[PDB]
Amino acid sequence: RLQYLIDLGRVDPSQPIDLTQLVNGRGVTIQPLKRDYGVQLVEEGADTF
Amino acid sequence: LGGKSSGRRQGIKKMEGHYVHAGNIIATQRHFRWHPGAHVGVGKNKCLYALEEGIVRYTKEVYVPHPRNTEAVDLITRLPKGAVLYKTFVHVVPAKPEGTFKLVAML
Amino acid sequence: LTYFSARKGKRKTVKAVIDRFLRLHCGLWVRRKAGYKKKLWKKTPARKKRLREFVFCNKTQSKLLDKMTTSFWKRRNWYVDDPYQKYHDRTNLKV
Amino acid sequence: TVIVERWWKVPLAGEGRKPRLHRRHRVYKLVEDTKHRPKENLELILTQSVENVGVRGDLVSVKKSLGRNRLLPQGLAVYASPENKKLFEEEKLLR
Amino acid sequence: KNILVRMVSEAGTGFCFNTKRNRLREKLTLLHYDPVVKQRVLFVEKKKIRSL
Amino acid sequence: DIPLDRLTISYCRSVNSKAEVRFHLATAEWIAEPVRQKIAITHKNKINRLGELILTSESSRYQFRNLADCLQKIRDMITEASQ
Amino acid sequence: QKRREREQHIAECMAKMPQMIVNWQQQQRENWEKAQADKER
Amino acid sequence: PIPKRMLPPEELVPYYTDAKNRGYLADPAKFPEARLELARKYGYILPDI
RNA sequence: UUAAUUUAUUAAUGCAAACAGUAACCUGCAUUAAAAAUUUCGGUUGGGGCGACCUCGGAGCAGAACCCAACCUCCGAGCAGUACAUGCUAAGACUUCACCAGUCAAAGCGAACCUCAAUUGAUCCA
Ligand SMILES: [Mg+2]
Ligand SMILES: [Mg+2]
Ligand SMILES: [Mg+2]
Ligand SMILES: [Mg+2]
Ligand SMILES: [Mg+2]
């Protein structure tokens, strides 16, 4: 997903990837109500990254 | 007064020529209306079940009881000198062979 | 089951269901077998084993449970290491 | 005086809001009485020698009934207020 | 006639199992498997748990 | 230990991928001589006609994991050889 | 600490056991003998 | 005013104080060691940053 | 009302609380009464009542895969005995015509070298 985002221009890897940046990009939507405690990085695109 | 018990739903669950997978129950009974034959087991109810993939077949086979089981032995002894008891047996005749050798690699 | 509440005017959940069952995201309903913490002495080991398993609810039962709860209990919940997480989504179905 | 714990839990309503109450919140359960308690003793400064129960000028712990219905009304003693304590100390010093 | 009794393992402590025994007779001692220890171990009777 | 320029790794997707790790056993200077000999003796089934100790692994969907497993295998073998 | 203590106890029990089992066996044998005697009488 | 974010509550403290999951309160002397370990496990070479 | 749950009212008591002294009247908590107050009055049934029955199992009706009623005809059960690996788990089935309950069970890991027809009872609470 991250890779895809990078490819698409949204989420710039020359800057740091903070949660805020991700949210702005609109890769990860999250919601504090319904007790989300942020993003978790996952293995799904392990190779081909 | 007395009891009104529900029907027990026992009997054959799989008939001759049916394809029966390992574990399938074949026939349920109280007492032995059928006996376990080749590749067929017996549960604690006397219920018969398939021990392998294959086809069910029924046969009338000569019956010899176990020596240790007394009542049967006694019965046998009682019979006249050219008599043989006979009983019905349920077999599974297995279809797919257990093994096939495949080529892993050329080393 | 209160199809419209007094103050909010929303449907309510029957919380019995919530207490007792686990809705997988695929909409299976999982339940602890009844009679499982009772009279275990007289029960044969096999029976005990049977009673200690979880079970999936019938279609009708599932439907009932869905009706009985609100859409909140049907949401996707991303828990850290819930032991059931792998069962929420369903794999390799065909009719 | 009776202290009365409220059964049934008031459902908790905001900073600047009254919480409306139900006829089941009206059900109480008396936790304690101020009565049926260990009887405490009150401090008094004696303005006169009294029997063996007090020495003039001294600060004593009396039975409350005696304080309230004999000593205080009769000008035989005064409360342990920090105000007059100083005065009494001064008097003692002078003596 | 028969009492239900709890039996406590000496080795592999915490594991207790419930068994029958006649009310008239001796406190029960028994070899039995502890899945904690993963060996057979002596259990000793301790506290009856209903009678029947 | 195990410098990866010596090793030959080749992948094969098929969900379960496969990661073929392979190397010439006798000429590997990073493995000790008696250790090497021991390895040869033991895991002769894995060794090719050409003289290359092949130990593929498949289990996970991601190839990285497979690679790691393969690497671990070599280490295990070495340990066994040692004692 | 908790893990240690229970574990220690378990170890102790294990150490004790081999002879306990033997004792139990002996007791059983004795009981059997008694039963036999009773039968004989 | 932009508030100060709070720390891990109780059971997240041991997560974020270890360098094997790249915790922001973990001691940065061990990070490189962790990285090395990771490299050793999953093949490939650490690119010096 | 000699069915159940209550005594908030009146009843005296008893213990507190208030009291005084010397070598009663009021409040709080207990008590058993009197008076009341909420309350409900199961079903099957050749009308209802009366009598009998109400759960589980085996045999006949129901003669040959299951299934099949009646206040139809007949037996019984609400336990025993042996173990204490009546250890863990697990493919695949059966199922008392739903559900709940029941049943059987290969392999594997641990170990050796169950009988019995019925013999039982959910949830929440303890
Ligand atoms: Mg608000
Ligand atoms: Mg009627
Ligand atoms: Mg009539
Ligand atoms: Mg059915
Ligand atoms: Mg087996």
Q: Which CATH number goes with the domain that contains F17?
A: 3.30.160.20
Q: How far apart are CA C65 and CA C84, in angstroms?
A: 19
Q: Which residue of E has its CA nearest to G21?
A: E42
Q: Sign of dihedral through CA atoms A40, A43, A47, A48?
A: negative
Q: Sign of dihedral through CA atoms F39, F40, F41, F46?
A: positive
Q: What 3-state class would DSSP assign to A26?
A: coil
C39 C-alpha to ligand 4 centroid (Å): 25
Q: Sign of dihedral through CA atoms F13, F18, F19, F22?
A: negative
For F20, the enclosing helix (H) or strand (E) is: strand F18-23
Nearest of B104, B94, B87, B102 to residue B32 by alpha carbon: B87
- Cβ contact B1 with chain I strand, < 7 A: yes
Phi, psi of B5 (to 5 degrees): -95, 150
Residue A35, min C-alpha distance to chain F (Å): 30
The parent domain of residue F46 ranges over 1-83
- Give the strands of the sheet with C21-23, arranged side by side: C21-23, C29-32, C54-56
Q: Which ligand is nearest to the CA of B51?
A: 5
Question: And the tokens for B52?
Answer: 């392998």
What is the number of CB-based contacts under 8 A between chain E and chain G?
29
CATH code matching the domain that covers B1-107, chosen among 3.40.50.720, 3.40.50.1110, 3.10.105.10, 2.40.50.100: 2.40.50.100
Q: In CATH, what is the architecture of E1-52?
A: Single Sheet (2.20)
To one decimal, the resolution in angstroms is 3.4
Question: Is there a contact between F64 and H42 if contact means CB atoms under 8 Å apart?
Answer: yes
Burial B29-67 (b: 16+ CB within 10 A, else e): beeeebbbbbbbeeeeebbbbbebbbbbbbeeeeeeeee
The residues near D57 (Cβ < 8 Å, ≥ 6 apart) are: D45, D46, D88, D91, D92, D95
- Cβ contact E15 with chain I strand, < 7 A: no
Q: How far apart are CA D18 and CA B50, in angstroms?
A: 73
CATH 3.40.5.10 fits D42-95, yes or no: yes
Nucleotide of closest approach to B13 (CA, C1'):
I94
Helices (H) and strands (E) in chain G, counts: 1, 0
Rounded CA–C1' distance between B27 and I106, in angstroms: 17
Nearest of D89, D38, D49, D40 to residue D71 by alpha carbon: D49
Interface of F with A in 44-83 (CB under 8 A): 62-65
Taking CB atoms and an 8 Å cutoff, what residues of chain A touch C73? none
Give, as ranges, the nucleotides of chain I with any atom within 7 Å of a protein CB: 16-20, 27-29, 52-54, 56-59, 62, 65-70, 72-76, 79-97, 99-106, 110-112, 114-115, 120-123
Helix pair F33-42, F63-82: axis angle to 10 deg: 110
Nucleotide of closest approach to E30 (CA, C1'):
I84
Note whether A49 contacts F: Cβ–Cβ < 8 A.
no
Strands in E1-52 per DSSP E: 2-9, 16-22, 29-34, 39-51
CB H30 within 8 Å of CB H38: no
Phi, psi of B47 (to 5 degrees): -80, 135
- Cβ contact D39 with chain I strand, < 7 A: yes
Which pairs from E18-27 meet CB under 8 Å and 24+ separation?
E18/C40, E18/C41, E18/E49, E20/C41, E21/E45, E23/E51
Residues 39-78 of C with CB within 7 A of strand I: 39, 42-52, 55, 57-58, 61
Residue with tokens 């007064």: B1
CB atoms within 10 A of CB A47: 15
Residue B96, min C-alpha distance to chain F (Å): 27
Question: And the tokens for E51?
Answer: 């009678």
Expt. technique: cryo-EM
In chain F, alpha helices (H)? 33-42, 63-82
Residue C17, min C-alpha distance to chain E (Å): 33
Phi, psi of H38 (to 5 degrees): -60, -45
Name the domain count of chain F.
Answer: 1
For H13, the enclosing helix (H) or strand (E) is: helix H13-16
Q: How far apart are CA B62 and CA B87, in angstroms?
A: 6
Phi, psi of C13 (to 5 degrees): -95, 140
Question: Is there a contact between C75 and A36 if contact means CB atoms under 8 Å apart?
Answer: no
Helix pair F63-82, H31-42: axis angle to 10 deg: 90
Residue with tokens 């915790």: H23
Residue C42, min C-alpha distance to chain A (Å): 46
Distances (CA, A) of F60 to C22, F13, F15: 29, 11, 8
The phi-psi region of residue F27 (left if phi > 0; otherwise alpha if psi is between -120 and 50; otherwise beta) is alpha
Phi, psi of H46 (to 5 degrees): -65, 120
Residues 13-72 of B with CB within 7 A of strand I: 13, 21-25, 28, 30, 41, 43-45, 47, 49, 51
Taking CB atoms and an 8 Å cutoff, what residues of chain F touch A47? 62-64
**DSSP conformation class of D48:** S
